[PDB]
């Protein structure tokens, strides 16, 4: 995940700054969960390829030199 | 009579929770497919024939390495007091290995390296001449 | 400040290794060039593992990397 | 980018490569602000400015 | 910046512009003094005079590369073991080159 | 005094230390000794550490978390947690006629043979530690079950942590 | 400069000199020739009488040595154990191998940032002293930890 | 007195689960590599053995990247042997690459045979002092 | 018991460092040919 | 009463290496 | 007095000078003499110059930098550094039964025969200097190794400076 330090900035100011803090934390967790899904996609697709090559449902790549 | 249940660990992060949940599913996919591959083509030969042991191959090591194969094999041979030999041409795309073990013998370190090398390189040991020999594949 | 403390002080910068040499024959722990082996694991900035920030200036707040990915994370919210 | 080093570049992926007789490597690749290298079995990062 | 508790210039460029030139000139002087101190060793090392061919012809410049790979795009690669190239061609000279045109 | 690694498997002369700091009163030292060698304070000390005790009928059971009493994924015994093991020996010293069963349990991650072998190894290690403290070989039996009969749900994190355990059952007759 | 590191982390020259001086006064021999470093420990300060069982109080010394080893940067460490002649060649070869295995494991458990640790036990084959009258009290029953500082 | 715990120990019930999953995946890799790898027995390995004559133990230093015939002839001439060729050179020659600083001639010959592959072979006769390069039909 | 390692020379200039590093490679290329 | 060192002496661990390289190159030149 | 080039290979009558400046007290002159002819002050004087001393078991080793004790790239001995050589003779005077090995080492720049020949020459020069100060010919041996077994890394400048050295080993019996 990408980090840049933000240096670019009272009765009810505190509670809404705190609510915005909770919203940002929740958004970051959601972004991480989609990244986890993407890496799982790539690894699971390759692993499934190995199983179907073993069970003779795909053809291997043929190479000429 | 305060009530308590035994595992009380340190607090956890939900990132680590999500990472663990992904890792478990990866793990049983790997287990099922490995079972299928073992059933389909049963192996017949073992690399104890090509790498037998000897005296002073029974010194021990613990290793954490994430680079190319040749320098690490040279370090093991130098620790075992053997000569080191290379056959064939090294490929342009390097052969990378990754070993993370604890307290095993040097013969098993070489056998694990030999298994991870795969179709790209091979390890042979001649104990009467005290030679460790790594040979590259005739590919490309 | 004090690099070669409890040694004789700084002798010179060895640029072949990127390290200072103290007045006894010990290598120092201080670096003296930027091409020294520092163990960097934490880097700032965004659009890493893409091409970096595509440098057009945008009417909206989207930040786009050089390979077409869009950083929603460095992008300002509404 | 054209990179001259004798470390081994791992992650960002290069387009062409050549090697000298004493073990220096030369790489041609696409631009990126970070490189992942292996030093002696240890994975670390190099930081590129000026892009 | 930080946490909940944490949230709750022309002389600049004129200083850089006079510092860069003075540093460059001073370091250039020191480099030239170190070069002039060691003038006989560099003449012994970069001995162009004893590489000259028969009719006072400077030899050509050749370059070598080893263990070459090119990934041209997806679907095609080309590899080679060694490559040799003529970077510069031979010609007549009247005087041999010296290290001073390169290093000074 | 006390040697911290298992006191060379000798019974520690614990009472004399209290009666020496109290004679250095004799009656107050005897009351403090007869309180702390009683069964309920030992049970409360296992409660103070992370070990659970269940009594129902004439069957008694100890529940031990491998997370704190073993090193990670090995049959080696964690030496920083020796007060709990010494208290286990002290509590088990009160029933010199019964037979003991020790059973080992893991969670669901991994292969089946791996789970069974690790359970068997951990149960044997705890049985050997019991046997080396004086208990005769005809009174003991160890068994390792895999993920056979769980007590929590393996699809959630804390329940899966609660599933990895060592069970000690013993009778009265 | 404020965001590049200015030194290798957790390391200081005064701390290196201080701990080397304290170890030499305590009795553990620390020597340096070129860039190779040797730490030599008598076996009586670590083990019981020829058994591979540590005393409980010697773990402070192993902790001190680990705190010394974290000050450098390195690739391989070698631990070798040597003993004195008791019964046969095999019994002390097994003894020295067990001693080196235990010591290198505790050092690996603590955070020494090495890539390889090699362990071997040579028995009583290479004595550094012709006076062989002690048992485990002899000066030539020892463990030696050697390494090379890298860059 | 003191025995600290390991510094990076999995002291967390999510971290624990992550580390065993990492253990089991690597176990499966070792199993897959063991099934997939093919080996040859050391009895029927077709590589030329070390011929242990006295003249072939001399040390050498070779940089070469070119045809096999010229380099093998020079190696034979340096060992005071004779050299003979049996077969036909193809249209595209057989190209090898040898780069060593200190090596004896017998293993240089062994590397020459290994790099030649199926197209050529090297035989050494130590009684009648000869080496012979044989092409493949 | 002040610790010291034997060769302690005058301080060096990094230009001389770079020139020496170029000269060594020139010298062993020269040796080989 | 007094001896002085040579005035242009390689009293520097980079200068020493420079002078050794300069010696060996000229040796190779005489051989060629 | 003292002749600065090696005192014509005579033992210098050093103690009488101190007891003459102190009688010119006798007891203070004897204490100053018995301090400075002791082994630890001689060892500290070699420490004050650039010579290293290592003692391990009953084997003793002196490490000498050729950078200060020889002229540049020659087997000639540097005459400005005679206090160090005199202190070497004084320290070696304490072990009149042992055998001596002197070994010479260079760095990696140059050709192999050149490195070997230069090492052999320097080792013989230091052995001849030892033999000329009284030590018998049956107690000495010199050997020159090339870049055979280095103690530092030759790819960096200071370690390469540390690699060029003379080693002196001797036993007790």
Numbering used by the authors:
A (entry chain CC): 153 to 161, 173 to 228
B (entry chain CD): 23 to 162
C (entry chain CN): 39 to 116
D (entry chain DH): 311 to 361
E (entry chain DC): 28 to 35, 57 to 152
F (entry chain CL), K (entry chain DL): 42 to 65, 88 to 236
G (entry chain CK): 38 to 188
H (entry chain Cd): 24 to 160
Sentences from the paper on this structure:
Legionella pneumophila is an opportunistic pathogen that causes the potentially fatal pneumonia known as Legionnaires’ disease. The pathology associated with infection depends on bacterial delivery of effector proteins into the host via the membrane spanning Dot/Icm type IV secretion system (T4SS). The Dot/Icm complex of L. pneumophila is one of the largest known T4SSs. The Dot/Icm T4SS has as many as 300 protein substrates, a striking contrast to the H. pylori Cag and B. pertussis Ptl T4SSs, each of which transports only one virulence factor.
We have determined a 3.8 Å asymmetric reconstruction (C1) of the Dot/Icm T4SS using single particle cryo-EM approaches. This resolution made it possible to trace connections between the OMC, which contains 13 copies of the asymmetric unit, and the PR, which contains 18 copies of the asymmetric unit. Unexpectedly, we observed five peptide chains originating from the PR, with attached densities sandwiched between the PR and OMC. The models that were generated from the 2.8 Å resolution, symmetry-imposed reconstructions of the OMC and PR were fit into the 3.8 Å map of the Dot/Icm T4SS that was generated without the imposition of symmetry. First, we observe 13 linkers between the OMC and PR (identified as residues 264–270 of DotH) in various conformations, revealing the direct connections between the two regions. Second, we observed five small globular folds located between the OMC and PR. These folds consist of two β-sheets and incorporate the linker from DotH as an additional β-strand in one of the two sheets. Close inspection clearly showed that these domains contain folds nearly identical to that of the C-terminal domain of DotH in the OMC (residues 278–360). Thus, there are 18 copies of DotH in the entire structure with all 18 NTDs comprising the PR, 13 of the associated CTDs extending up to build part of the OMC disk, and the other five CTDs extending up only part way into the intervening space. The flexibility of these five DotH CTDs suggests a mechanism through which the symmetry mismatch observed between the OMC and PR can be accommodated though the utility of the symmetry mismatch cannot be inferred.
